Enzyme design. Structure first.
Site, PDB file in Angstrom:
ATOM      1  N   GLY A  21     -52.130   0.747   3.592  1.00  0.00           N
ATOM      2  CA  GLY A  21     -51.227   1.671   2.935  1.00  0.00           C
ATOM      3  C   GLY A  21     -49.743   1.456   3.146  1.00  0.00           C
ATOM      4  O   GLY A  21     -48.965   1.549   2.196  1.00  0.00           O
ATOM      5  N   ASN A  22     -49.335   1.159   4.375  1.00  0.00           N
ATOM      6  CA  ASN A  22     -47.913   0.980   4.642  1.00  0.00           C
ATOM      7  C   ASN A  22     -47.332  -0.302   4.046  1.00  0.00           C
ATOM      8  O   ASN A  22     -46.129  -0.544   4.149  1.00  0.00           O
ATOM      9  CB  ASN A  22     -47.635   1.044   6.145  1.00  0.00           C
ATOM     10  N   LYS A  48     -62.066  -2.041   2.786  1.00  0.00           N
ATOM     11  CA  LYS A  48     -61.249  -3.238   2.641  1.00  0.00           C
ATOM     12  C   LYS A  48     -61.278  -4.161   3.851  1.00  0.00           C
ATOM     13  O   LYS A  48     -61.167  -5.381   3.711  1.00  0.00           O
ATOM     14  CB  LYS A  48     -59.798  -2.856   2.351  1.00  0.00           C
ATOM     15  N   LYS A  88     -67.473   9.003   0.543  1.00  0.00           N
ATOM     16  CA  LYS A  88     -66.097   8.841   0.117  1.00  0.00           C
ATOM     17  C   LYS A  88     -65.708   9.660  -1.105  1.00  0.00           C
ATOM     18  O   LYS A  88     -66.058   9.311  -2.230  1.00  0.00           O
ATOM     19  CB  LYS A  88     -65.804   7.356  -0.134  1.00  0.00           C
ATOM     20  N   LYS A 118     -61.551  -0.717  11.273  1.00  0.00           N
ATOM     21  CA  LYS A 118     -60.748  -1.866  11.671  1.00  0.00           C
ATOM     22  C   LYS A 118     -61.266  -2.435  12.987  1.00  0.00           C
ATOM     23  O   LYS A 118     -61.347  -3.654  13.163  1.00  0.00           O
ATOM     24  CB  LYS A 118     -59.283  -1.458  11.816  1.00  0.00           C
TER      25      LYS A 118
HETATM   26  N1  LIG Z   1     -57.027   5.138  18.562  1.00  0.00           N
HETATM   27  C1  LIG Z   1     -56.161   4.995  17.496  1.00  0.00           C
HETATM   28  N2  LIG Z   1     -55.134   4.091  17.790  1.00  0.00           N
HETATM   29  C2  LIG Z   1     -54.156   3.815  16.818  1.00  0.00           C
HETATM   30  N3  LIG Z   1     -54.114   4.358  15.566  1.00  0.00           N
HETATM   31  C3  LIG Z   1     -55.165   5.257  15.328  1.00  0.00           C
HETATM   32  C4  LIG Z   1     -56.189   5.594  16.233  1.00  0.00           C
HETATM   33  N4  LIG Z   1     -57.042   6.483  15.703  1.00  0.00           N
HETATM   34  C5  LIG Z   1     -56.578   6.690  14.491  1.00  0.00           C
HETATM   35  N5  LIG Z   1     -55.425   5.967  14.183  1.00  0.00           N
HETATM   36  C6  LIG Z   1     -54.740   6.036  12.873  1.00  0.00           C
HETATM   37  O1  LIG Z   1     -55.421   4.984  12.119  1.00  0.00           O
HETATM   38  C7  LIG Z   1     -54.360   4.577  11.213  1.00  0.00           C
HETATM   39  C8  LIG Z   1     -54.721   3.307  10.437  1.00  0.00           C
HETATM   40  O2  LIG Z   1     -55.794   3.500   9.501  1.00  0.00           O
HETATM   41  P1  LIG Z   1     -55.361   3.991   8.047  1.00  0.00           P
HETATM   42  O3  LIG Z   1     -54.480   5.158   8.091  1.00  0.00           O
HETATM   43  O4  LIG Z   1     -56.598   4.085   7.276  1.00  0.00           O
HETATM   44  O5  LIG Z   1     -54.453   2.770   7.573  1.00  0.00           O
HETATM   45  P2  LIG Z   1     -54.605   1.643   6.471  1.00  0.00           P
HETATM   46  O6  LIG Z   1     -54.033   2.110   5.165  1.00  0.00           O
HETATM   47  O7  LIG Z   1     -53.833   0.486   6.993  1.00  0.00           O
HETATM   48  O8  LIG Z   1     -56.057   1.336   6.323  1.00  0.00           O
HETATM   49  C9  LIG Z   1     -53.214   4.388  12.114  1.00  0.00           C
HETATM   50  O9  LIG Z   1     -52.008   4.017  11.491  1.00  0.00           O
HETATM   51  C10 LIG Z   1     -53.277   5.731  12.874  1.00  0.00           C
HETATM   52  O10 LIG Z   1     -52.483   6.742  12.137  1.00  0.00           O
HETATM   53 MG   LIG Z   2     -57.501   2.821   5.882  1.00  0.00          MG
END
Ligand SMILES: Nc1ncnc2c1ncn2[C@@H]1O[C@H](COP(=O)(O)OP(=O)(O)O)[C@@H](O)[C@H]1O
Ligand SMILES: [Mg+2]
Ligand SMILES: Nc1ncnc2c1ncn2[C@@H]1O[C@H](COP(=O)(O)OP(=O)(O)O)[C@@H](O)[C@H]1O
Ligand SMILES: [Mg+2]
Lengths: 309, 309
Positions: free
Chosen positions: B10-11, B208, B127, B270
């Protein structure tokens, strides 16, 4: 076998029903015909149009237009249709190749087609697109940079340029796939219009047949095969004395062109693109026919309107 | 350098508004960071998400839904977003590559990701996606088997499965482009979900990162780099005793995962993808960090949460 750029048109997605499923079904039928070419040893490089598909997508952009869900510009809409149609076509081709027991990879490549900013088409946009807006919505759009022209009686509709394609950005990538015997789908809708080295996206409509002809030049194809709604280009088309053209040469076509036999917009662009391809390099061929007419092939020989020097 | 699959999130599309222009500018910034990796000799194979983009597209499908302009199914919408985002990203990357004086070509290949119909996900979809409908609308929409769940106070939404990828149809084509030093953008939005011998499209959302990990295995990448919203994965996330994870082993991550430190739906996939890649073959590394943290690279080495074993 010949390396050929096959330029599909409306007839390749003949469905009436505008649903994805109906269009996919139409593309499966189209693919059955294309596989005949593969069975005969030809190396296909496929392109397609996006008329009704981008038209409906543009209406969808307007229907939900808001600050939170802004209408996507035409170049992005073209990219989206390269995605939808490319998916439908590549999927349909895989199905028909499998049905024939033939193993061959198919891949769709997003394609940005470069145009010249100095192109006379930019000063004089003539391609009407989108929905018919009211004078109010028109003036509002006018102040927004768009160019609208009232179609006397029908309303006001946005007009964009129809510039000449001067290059295909992904040409080398497509060539790479070609050399690896992969069936490529590219130049969808004539390509995503871009200008300059920076590939600046622009709202324009590039003729699919000229875009396909440029691709044919860049990948050094042996032939440019434009598949459309007729088995043969004709003189006196639709008239009592209609005559189908089979083997033709450039001088013959130029004579008929001046007699007004090729309708502007529909058949004329195909004739001009075909002539351009045959004139581009020695020993080149262009063919204008239909998917259904492939059933009349003689061995690996495609029949229809066959153009040579 | 190292062949690495870079999974954007997303970022990577950090825009102040949902306009194509704003999102394209966001991808230009993202591309600036990607060029850093390229300058260090790394061979990139990029993927991206499509949450906000497909979300707005689905709303557009609903807004104009009619017999003449029918809403496109989810799989076709995903293909469309591979087209739009693929165009935006490839165009942005080319712009940044040229600025750096690097002669590298970029290409987006539509990607169909195969799933197993027996996947548990089909029996328990999780989802939510698309527009919020009324109870009456959801009731009718569920008669054919689709699952809709109420979001109290907001409406009812379709809930689709998140099945695991068992294959990437265009994997060999992508690898071929990789072998020819071409930067590829694939698996957009996790891929167009398909099933069976005919690769029939299905409405689902393939994660993804799982898709990217599968691609990484199929193209024999050296590293899987997931770029997300944090520079480092943490344990005791958001708590006074929060700890950032740097170099960490699979065993350590498994313990942490069992302790519930990684949020489901966001960070958990992830972590699971990273573990799966490191255990997939010897000499494989997985990294989870952010685009911004790439500014802290030690030479050609990426810092962040680095998984090894
Ligand atoms: N233990 C954790 N450590 C770091 N980030 C975490 C953790 N648990 C949840 N997050 C969140 O997970 C987010 C990333 O997943 P997501 O928001 O789905 O991003 P993306 O769009 O890159 O898939 C981080 O940016 C954070 O806000
Ligand atoms: Mg995500
Ligand atoms: N001399 C001509 N000979 C044959 N077809 C012609 C001629 N002049 C016009 N046409 C029309 O041109 C059509 C093909 O162009 P067009 O409708 O633009 O199709 P496409 O979607 O393939 O571009 C034919 O199917 C036919 O209806
Ligand atoms: Mg036409």
């Amino acid at each position: 076998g010949k390396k050929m750029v096959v330029a599909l048109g409306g007839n390749a997605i003949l469905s009436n029903d505008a649903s994805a499923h109906a269009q996919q079904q139409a593309l499966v039928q189209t693919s059955a015909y294309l596989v005949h070419l593969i069975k005969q040893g030809h190396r296909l490089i496929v392109s397609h149009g996006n008329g009704p598909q981008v038209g409906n997508l543009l209406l969808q952009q307007q229907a939900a237009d808001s600050e939170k869900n802004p209408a996507m510009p035409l170049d992005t809409c073209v990219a989206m249709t390269q995605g939808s149609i490319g998916y439908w076509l590549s999927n349909a081709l895989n199905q028909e190749l499998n049905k024939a027991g033939i193993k061959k990879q198919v891949a769709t490549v997003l394609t940005q087609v470069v145009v010249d900013p100095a192109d006379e088409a930019f000063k004089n946009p003539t391609k009407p697109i989108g929905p018919f807006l009211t004078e109010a919505e028109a003036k509002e759009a006018m102040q927004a940079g768009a160019i609208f022209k009232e179609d006397a009686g029908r309303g006001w509709r946005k007009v964009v340029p129809s510039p000449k394609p001067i290059d295909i950005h992904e040409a080398e990538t497509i060539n790479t796939l070609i050399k690896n015997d992969i069936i490529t789908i590219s130049c969808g809708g004539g390509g995503i219009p871009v200008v300059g080295q920076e590939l600046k996206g622009v709202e324009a409509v590039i003729d699919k047949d000229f875009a396909s002809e440029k691709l044919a030049e860049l990948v050094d194809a042996d032939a440019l095969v434009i598949l459309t709604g007729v088995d043969y280009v004709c003189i006196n088309y639709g008239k009592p004395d209609e005559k189908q053209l089979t083997n033709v040469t450039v001088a013959e076509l130029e004579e008929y062109k001046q007699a007004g036999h090729f309708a502007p917009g529909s058949m004329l662009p195909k004739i001009e693109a075909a002539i351009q391809f045959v004139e581009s390099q020695p020993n080149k061929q262009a063919i204008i026919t239909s998917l259904e007419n492939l059933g009349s092939m003689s061995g690996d020989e495609i029949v229809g309107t066959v153009v040579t020097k």
